[PDB]
A paper describes a structure:
The LRR-RKs HAESA (greek: to adhere to) and HAESA-LIKE 2 (HSL2) redundantly control floral abscission. A receptor protein called HAESA is found on the surface of the cells that surround a future break point on the plant. When its time to shed an organ, a hormone called IDA instructs HAESA to trigger the shedding process.
We next investigated whether HAESA binds N-terminally extended versions of IDA. We obtained a structure of HAESA in complex with a PKGV-IDA peptide at 1.94 Å resolution. Consistently, PKGV-IDA and IDA have similar binding affinities in our ITC assays, further indicating that HAESA senses a dodecamer peptide comprising residues 58-69IDA. The PKGV motif present in our N-terminally extended IDA peptide is highlighted in red. While the sequence of the mature IDA peptide has not been experimentally determined in planta, our HAESA-IDA complex structures and calorimetry assays suggest that active IDLs are hydroxyprolinated dodecamers.
Numbering used by the authors:
A (entry chain A): 18 to 46, 50 to 615
B (entry chain B): 58 to 69
Write the structure that this text describes.
């Protein structure tokens, strides 16, 4: 009874100093306090832990909670605790082992006196506030702290060297603050029990200090988004329990450490956006690897065959390097490949036929390589695909039939290859298709009517092919269509007269075909049309006056069979290049007509 | 919020 009374009163007093607009603490408003929401007790009925995570509470830090004599854990994670921390707020909190103030609205400085007032803490988190000024050097006095998280504040100055005296630390998270440009303090090498070191976005310069080789229990080393220089040190390779190395967006130079191949525990490795040279290490035995990102470097040589030993690999992004050679033929057969982006390299030979062997591949991005041969019929059945970009390669043959109708495919980009064949009617199944980009190929036959059923289409880009027959009337009711480019084909017939469905059409390019009839008057009523190119066709009749409504970046009606007068808005000689090659046309230059 | 400690999501 005694302890239930005490606890209930202190808890109610604390609650009175907060605003609770979500009624999260209604249970504190019959029942023993040991069963109130967020409240845990020990066997003698004393409150030991108060967890008010995500309760939408507003107001100053409720330091009255510290008057509970057995309180060991306090979490106010993700509320609206506001104002600043004073020295006084923590005077009575000296029994705490765990304190979580992350994701609140706190401002101002960390009190210098915090370690003195909270000497028993093992876990301190104040991540995601607006804390400013420096991390106090007194933080070097904590005798028991295991985890420190100050990530995502406006803390400035530099990371204090005295943190190296907190040799009980297992996690140190200081990422995304406003520190001055400085080196990683060498003294952090004394934190020999560290498992997590997260100093992303900390304005770090210079090398990773050699002392950090003493951090032999590292599991996650994350130094992303800094300006670190020199080699990625080869001691990361001998970490027996390393799972994650994140070093992207730095200025690392030299080569990937040669013996990376033996890091059997490694799950994720990202050293993208650096200045790495040399080759991808070979004899890979990266048994646990899930993600390998090495994009935007100056890597050369091949993707080693031994990558296929990584039977859990799901993400491989190597784009923007100078990699060469043929891909390992078995790539993807034995891995749940999800995201593959090898663009802007010099790869050659065929696309591995089972890149989607496990049925998980979503992105297949191979732009700007010299891949040759055909797309495997396998890929025609890769139903998980959303984003395919195969442009600017040396691919040939007919596209696999089912590829056109994949149910989740959003971007299909095949441009600048030598693909042949007609677009099949199975394109009707591509319900999610947004962008069809197939220019600069040898596709033949007629544009199938079913492309008009794909209501989401925003782009049909088919220039420089061998398309013939008519533009299907169906395209004219694609409400979201932004860009229609079918220039340099063999299309015939007319443009449909009813075009009000084209409310989003920004570009209409049908130059260099065999199109006939009149330019329909409704071209000029399209609300966002900025590009119109109908040149090099057999359009006849008069240029509609409604074109004068539009603000056209490009207007080109040259090399047709058009007649009558040029609309008066375009009568100046600066637009003359728009209308050349229409022998029947003239300009009304002050009275008579000039050809 | 704060970017997680995880792989870059950049891609083409
Ligand atoms: C790769 O990493 C580099 C650095 O290693 C990175 O450059 C940095 O990017 C940040 C964020 O985009 C840039 O910061 C800017 O700073 C200027 C002031 O000089 C301001 O315009 C902005 O700061 C605002 O910050 C507050 C928001 O909380 C506002 O309230 C305030 O009024 C400011 O306007 C802006 O964020 C900067 O270019 C650098 N910074 C540093 C420290 O290097 C680069 O972007 C990274 N590239 C990629 C692709 O990831
Ligand atoms: C912070 O707390 C807010 C409010 O409690 C959380 O927002 C809720 O998120 C859940 C999903 O888990 C939804 O069911 C609710 O509808 C959301 N409510 C509101 C008002 O947004 C928010 O997710 C929490 N943030 C974190 C990082 O945990
Ligand atoms: C914490 O700082 C942030 C960033 O300065 C503030 O968030 C908003 O910032 C944008 C511009 O970055 C402004 O348009 C908003 O007006 C800011 N929100 C406001 C005033 O509510 C945020 O205000 C800061 N939080 C506190 C509690 O001071
Ligand atoms: C309007 O379109 C015509 C072609 O339909 C353009 O003329 C071609 O321009 C290129 C220059 O890059 C030449 O290689 C072709 O030989 C030209 N064709 C003919 C038949 O002359 C013309 O330049 C475009 N006009 C404007 C003003 O952009
Ligand atoms: C804390 O938040 C409330 C409501 O948003 C506000 O009225 C109060 O003055 C805030 N306190 C401080 C110190 O900003
Ligand atoms: C703490 O760290 C500082 C800075 O490296 C150092 O000078 C001091 O001797 C260390 N000792 C103790 C007992 O905290
Ligand atoms: C990998 O190889 C290097 C030497 O070649 C060695 O120092 C390191 O301890 C090895 N790592 C593992 C995890 O076996
Ligand atoms: Mg090999
Ligand atoms: Mg295209």
């Amino acid at each position: 009874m005694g302890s239930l009374n005490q606890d209930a009163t202190i808890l109610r007093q604390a609650k009175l100093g907060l605003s609770d607009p979500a009624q999260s603490l209604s249970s504190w408003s019959d029942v023993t306090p040991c069963k109130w929401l967020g409240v845990s007790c020990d066997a003698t009925s004393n409150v030991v832990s108060v967890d008010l995570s995500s309760f939408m509470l507003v107001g100053p830090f409720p330091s009255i909670l510290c008057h509970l004599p057995s309180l060991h854990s306090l979490s106010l994670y993700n509320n609206s605790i506001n104002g600043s921390l004073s020295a006084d707020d923590f005077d009575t909190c000296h029994n705490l082992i765990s304190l979580d103030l992350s994701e609140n609205l706190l401002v101002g400085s960390i009190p210098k006196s915090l370690p003195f007032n909270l000497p028993n803490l093992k876990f301190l988190e104040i991540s995601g506030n607006n804390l400013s000024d420096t991390i106090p050097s007194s933080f070097g006095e904590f005798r028991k702290l295991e985890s420190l998280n100050l990530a995502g504040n406006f803390l400035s100055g530099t990371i204090p060297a005295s943190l190296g005296n907190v040799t009980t630390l297992k996690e140190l998270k200081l990422a995304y603050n406003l520190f001055s440009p400085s080196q990683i303090p060498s003294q952090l090498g004394n934190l020999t029990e560290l498992q997590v070191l997260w100093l992303a976005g900390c304005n770090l310069v210079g090398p990773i200090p050699p002392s950090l080789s003493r951090l032999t229990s590292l599991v996650n080393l994350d130094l992303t988004f800094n300006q670190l220089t020199g080699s990625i040190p080869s001691w990361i390779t001998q970490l027996k329990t390393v799972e994650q190395i994140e070093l992207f967006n730095n200025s690392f130079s030299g080569e990937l450490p040669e013996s990376m191949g033996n890091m059997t525990t490694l799950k994720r490795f990202d050293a993208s956006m650096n200045k790495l040279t040399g080759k991808i290490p070979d004899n890979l035995n990266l048994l646990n690897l899930e993600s390998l990102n090495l994009f935007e470097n100056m890597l050369e040589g091949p993707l080693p065959e031994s990558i296929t030993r990584s039977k859990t690999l799901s993400e491989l992004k190597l784009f923007n390097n100078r990699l060469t050679g043929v891909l390992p033929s078995q790539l993807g057969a034995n891995s749940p490949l999800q995201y593959v982006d090898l663009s802007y390299n010099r790869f050659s030979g065929e696309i591995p036929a089972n890149v989607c062997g496990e049925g998980k591949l979503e992105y297949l991005i191979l732009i700007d390589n010299s891949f040759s041969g055909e797309i495997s019929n396998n890929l025609g059945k890769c139903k998980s695909l959303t984003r395919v970009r195969l442009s600017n390669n040396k691919l040939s043959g007919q596209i696999p039939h089912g590829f056109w109708g994949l149910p989740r495919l959003s971007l299909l980009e095949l441009s600048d290859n030598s693909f042949t064949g007609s677009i099949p009617k199975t394109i009707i199944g591509a319900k999610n298709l947004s962008n069809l980009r197939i220019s600069k190929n040898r596709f033949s036959g007629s544009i199938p009517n079913e492309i008009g059923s794909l209501n989401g289409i925003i782009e049909i880009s088919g220039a420089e092919n061998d398309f013939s027959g008519e533009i299907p009337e169906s395209l004219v009711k694609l409400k979201q269509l932004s860009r229609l480019d079918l220039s340099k084909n063999q299309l015939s017939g007319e443009i449909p007269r009813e075009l009000r469905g084209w409310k989003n059409l920004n570009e209409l390019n049908l130059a260099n075909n065999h199109l006939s009839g009149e330019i329909p008057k409704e071209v000029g009523i399209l609300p966002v049309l900025n590009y119109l190119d109908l040149s090099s066709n057999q359009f006849s009749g008069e240029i509609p006056l409604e074109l004068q409504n539009l603000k056209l970046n490009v207007l080109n009606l040259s090399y047709n069979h058009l007649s009558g007068k040029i609309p008066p808005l375009y009568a100046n000689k600066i637009y003359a290049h728009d209308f050349i090659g229409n022998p029947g046309l003239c300009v009304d230059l002050d009275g008579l007509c000039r050809k | 919020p704060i970017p997680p400690s995880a792989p870059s999501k950049r891609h083409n």
